[PDB]
Amino acid sequence: AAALGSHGSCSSEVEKETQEKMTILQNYFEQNRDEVLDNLLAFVCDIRPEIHENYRI
Amino acid sequence: TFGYVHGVSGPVVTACDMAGAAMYELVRVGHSELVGEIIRLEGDMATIQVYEETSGVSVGDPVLRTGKPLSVELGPGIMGAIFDGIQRPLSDISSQTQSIYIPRGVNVSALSRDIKWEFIPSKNLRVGSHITGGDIYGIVNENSLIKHKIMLPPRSRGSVTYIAPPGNYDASDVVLELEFEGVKEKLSMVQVWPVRQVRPVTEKLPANHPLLTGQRVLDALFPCVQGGTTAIPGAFGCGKTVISQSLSKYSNSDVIIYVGCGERGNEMSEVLRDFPELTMEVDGKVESIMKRTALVANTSNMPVAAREASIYTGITLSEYFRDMGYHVSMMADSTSRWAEALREISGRLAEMPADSGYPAYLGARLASFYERAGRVKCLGNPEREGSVSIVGAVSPPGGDFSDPVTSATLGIVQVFWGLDKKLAQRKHFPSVNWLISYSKYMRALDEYYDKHFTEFVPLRTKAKEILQEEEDLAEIVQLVGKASLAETDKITLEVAKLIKDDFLQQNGYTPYDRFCPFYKTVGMLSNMISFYDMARRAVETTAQSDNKITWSIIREHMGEILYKLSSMKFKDPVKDGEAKIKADYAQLLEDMQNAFRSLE
Amino acid sequence: EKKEKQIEQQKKIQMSNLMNQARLKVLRARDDLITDLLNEAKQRLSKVVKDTTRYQVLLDGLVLQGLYQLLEPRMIVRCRKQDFPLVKAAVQKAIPMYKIATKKDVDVQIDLEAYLPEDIAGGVEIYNGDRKIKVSNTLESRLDLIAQQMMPEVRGALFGANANRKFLD
Amino acid sequence: NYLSQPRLTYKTVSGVNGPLVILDHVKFPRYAEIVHLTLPDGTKRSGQVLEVSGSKAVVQVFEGTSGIDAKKTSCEFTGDILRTPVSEDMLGRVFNGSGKPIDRGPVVLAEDFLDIMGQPINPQCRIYPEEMIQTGISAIDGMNSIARGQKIPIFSAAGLPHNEIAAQICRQAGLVKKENFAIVFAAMGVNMETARFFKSDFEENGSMDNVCLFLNLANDPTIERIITPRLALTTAEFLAYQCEKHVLVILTDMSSYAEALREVSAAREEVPGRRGFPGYMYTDLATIYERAGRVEGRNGSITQIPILTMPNDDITHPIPDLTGYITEGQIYVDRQLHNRQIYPPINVLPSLSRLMKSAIGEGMTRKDHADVSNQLYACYAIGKDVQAMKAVVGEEALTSDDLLYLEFLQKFEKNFITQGPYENRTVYETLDIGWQLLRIFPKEMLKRIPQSTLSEFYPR
């Protein structure tokens, strides 16, 4: 019964900690997504054309 | 100049524009500079066995030819270095990369540049002097114990055009320039040698002096000569470390090399951790053995070529130190794991299996390796002798000597120190089985012993006979009990037990047995055998008498001599002078003679 | 007596049944957020291609880059129909740079008969003359390729560096 | 930085031969390059380049070549070798042989990419193994104790319960507790029942937050079975040597892996070596097994326990033989014990942990432990000798001393070795069971133990 009586408390706690972690993710996401996207988009949009370096001539 | 990759299949890389290559020429492959050896030419195409994993090599990648076959850089900075089997410095590949791995595509120079050393040019030389391979044109003081003698490479010769003055120099400095046939050769303290080629000598000599290990059983009953070839059955249950540590931390050998053929990863790190902590006494100072060695360590996962090269790098380093006039000694931790690297490279080469799986050449590779040992007159002019002693461990499956590497090794080596798990389970350290073990160098040490220890050959002969007689008598003891044996047999068994327990056995952790000098060893055995002959005299002299002497009467009236004989091991070469030890042993001879006279 | 020890593991089991799923929902959230950052990036690329100035600079790159991989005597560029004038300019600027870098002549065509699907967020495909070898240089392809390789930098910047990374080795 | 250049795709399938597809007119191919084949019907398949030569690239396709053709087939090249996306979030999760997850969770957000082939750990940097891992099975922890950083295979045979032992180690394993430990369990050639057993038993019996589970099924394509060990070890190297975690890697059947090296070597047309295995099988198993040990300046540590089905029960077979050469021990599962319904049926006589004396002792476990294990081995050995004597001489001919060794033997198999699938005995509970048996003897019969240790632990 000491283990069994802990289950509902643990069930609520894992949801609380999931909601907190997902909130932390959403906060980090909203704080960082702009800079991250701008970096990726800039690398997409900066082509830097190169030949393969093994080309002899 | 350089070629280009044409194809790859597993570790085998085909290249093109290789027209100027040679078979077994060393090559760098790929943008990451992977190491490999050419194993076929096909015209302007060549096939390279790559060592490291070829994953990510591309067609059209560069293939730089190295101007040399597989080779060892030789010079200052060897001492205390740890190399792998293809001569890459594992201590520096650590400290320079700050990584726990060997990165695929290492290019670190084997003897580290920019490190200056104190170089003394040989003050006897002048510009215009004649010079030849093996001439000591200078010395590098790289460590207090080992003056590194520089020498002209064996292929080089000519007249000195310039020599550096005394000072601090490194591998990039042109220490020497010489001319021959109108052509100048520039030279450095670093020298290079093909690893599979013997370094030549003025004359290979007959070996005639003991490689004193400070270990009674070895040094007395199975002496290995300096320059001798020997094997140890290296297996976990028998304590192979005992011999290899004792050889390094005491034995009469100026420089040690140790080759990890292909050891288990942890057991290799055990050695590399532990050896730096060993110390030996020199000039009344205590110093780390890393002043007198270099370790060529390969774990089982190092490339197949690095395992099969391991012993050839080791011997090449050892021959370079031999040509400085040192009595080098080289361990190989498992010639069996080197023989597996042979099986694997022959498997990749698709060569036919000979004995049990091994290549046809396994016996010839072993034999042409072991022949690199011996005492020699060096090349060049200062006339010095040197040697390489080879201590090649073997690991026969279940102890079965019919195993091809073990069988060929016992065919070639002149000494076998047969360690035994039974003796180790009984804690009979050094645990060498004296019945199985042998040395073919007995004859060759007659000259030495006749000069320095003229009684010792009689003593050794008697000792082996006494122990052999006890092994035969033990069958009678099992059949009919100790009570049934003759008095001569009973005293022989008691003395053989004394020899076994208080002479063969030696506790190398104790201050008195951590090492054991040869004079100590002789004096201990001399007393035990002098006691045997006088005890046996009293027994046999009282054959057919009314009162007959027996071992029990000897133990009753003079068991103090038996107690003293067992006690003779405690004498200490540090706290007791050599003369004091000899005097105590001479006193025990007088004591026992007077005690025997009280009976007969 | 053994069961009275085992109930501590039953507590750990019930904890694991809950925890192991709860953290999978956090991981699912992480990957959804990355997937939405890629969705926003694809939307932003679909905005960028509406500027003919920057889009010309993109095509000038993407075309020349395709050619520099597929070194051949004859090549075909495939593009969306409406982009063709910008692509033609890109090909005409790329051919000189092809000769300069490759040291060999080329014939390049745009396949006006076989335009790419209109819903692609711009960029080009390039095929060799045999139509047996191709390279795909759509902005969506580069976004997938670069986002996949930069994923550790994405994670580390987006959700912060993990303090357990004591060594980078 | 990264491959900023776009991926080529070819229709140039010049041939197909068993599991191989031969592209031609290929531009600068890499050996071991990953490719994505697309069938005529649009089905994606992975493959890797198994050979290259001039214009040709021989891809081994992962799945069989069923449905490939010389025309409508197309083949994208990634430009790169196989890198695993790796992270600490690979704990608590279940992966197929390719490293695609199958626990219904999302794809891995890599904390870094790593080369799956790894690199050799520098022998200067490897550090000696010197503190015990508790596996909880008494026949391991009290007789064959594992130093963290040891490699020690469980040899077994077809039909024996080595998969239940492997699962029991994976649930029970951890630090001694005089938090920062995680198993990586990798399984190859697993029949789908045994794969359900691992996935289900690990998810059920509390383990998952400290384990990574790689499954390669028996019918997963054979190159994925070669990939899985390297994949798992690449994760273990990340967890240990970058994230400071202690790790135990469990490899479930190295024989099913040797059975894969056969196929890939035949795919290269290499001539078969000793007993039909590749000649380089020693090096390949070393490049699996030696991805292990502690290292200089990291708290992290990889142990390995390779489970290994000896074909035909033969220790001379190359798979156990080579493994015995590379790894610092062996643990033998025995059909004699399994038929007696003893579980776990580890035979403690031929088993040996070569690092035991550095795993265990004072501070690391308990002071007595190194003494007790020698004595238990001696009593079990003399017990077996006496049991053979009883069968010859009959009970009344036994001495009082023999009857003690026989009573110890009986109680030792029925209490020390026998443990059941969920009884997680600590080292301390194993030693207390060791004393509960050794106390059957008169104090003076326990001749391997020091008189001090007896005076400190023989009293109850």
From Swiss-Prot, chain C:
Name assigned to this protein: V-type proton ATPase subunit E 1
Full protein: residues contained: 58 to 226 of 226
GO terms, molecular function: ATPase binding; proton-transporting ATPase activity, rotational mechanism
Entry keyword annotation includes Cell membrane: yes
Keywords: Acetylation, Cell membrane, Cytoplasmic vesicle, Hydrogen ion transport, Ion transport, Membrane, Phosphoprotein, Synapse, Transport
Native species: Rattus norvegicus
Domain of life of the source: Eukaryota
A cellular component annotation (GO) from this entry: apical plasma membrane
Subunit structure: V-ATPase is a heteromultimeric enzyme made up of two complexes: the ATP-hydrolytic V1 complex and the proton translocation V0 complex. The V1 complex consists of three catalytic AB heterodimers that form a heterohexamer, three peripheral stalks each consisting of EG heterodimers, one central rotor including subunits D and F, and the regulatory subunits C and H. The proton translocation complex V0 consists of the proton transport subunit a, a ring of proteolipid subunits c9c'', rotary subunit d, subunits e and f, and the accessory subunits ATP6AP1/Ac45 and ATP6AP2/PRR.
Membrane topology: Peripheral membrane protein
Function comment: Subunit of the V1 complex of vacuolar(H+)-ATPase (V-ATPase), a multisubunit enzyme composed of a peripheral complex (V1) that hydrolyzes ATP and a membrane integral complex (V0) that translocates protons. V-ATPase is responsible for acidifying and maintaining the pH of intracellular compartments and in some cell types, is targeted to the plasma membrane, where it is responsible for acidifying the extracellular environment.
Tissue specificity note: Expressed in brain (at protein level).
Gene Ontology BP term (one): proton transmembrane transport
Family under the similarity heading: Belongs to the V-ATPase E subunit family.
Subcellular location: Apical cell membrane; Cytoplasmic vesicle, Secretory vesicle, Synaptic vesicle membrane; Cytoplasmic vesicle, Clathrin-coated vesicle membrane
UniProtKB/Swiss-Prot annotation, chain D:
Identification of the protein by name: V-type proton ATPase subunit B, brain isoform
Organism superkingdom: Eukaryota
Family, similarity comment: Belongs to the ATPase alpha/beta chains family.
Organism encoding this protein: Rattus norvegicus
Cellular compartment(s): Apical cell membrane; Melanosome; Cytoplasm; Cytoplasmic vesicle, Secretory vesicle, Synaptic vesicle membrane
Gene that this polypeptide is encoded by: Atp6v1b2
Gene3D superfamilies in the record: 3.40.50.12240
UniProt-listed CDD domains: ATP-synt_V_A-type_beta_C, ATP-synt_V_A-type_beta_N, V_A-ATPase_B
Protein role: Non-catalytic subunit of the V1 complex of vacuolar(H+)-ATPase (V-ATPase), a multisubunit enzyme composed of a peripheral complex (V1) that hydrolyzes ATP and a membrane integral complex (V0) that translocates protons. V-ATPase is responsible for acidifying and maintaining the pH of intracellular compartments and in some cell types, is targeted to the plasma membrane, where it is responsible for acidifying the extracellular environment.
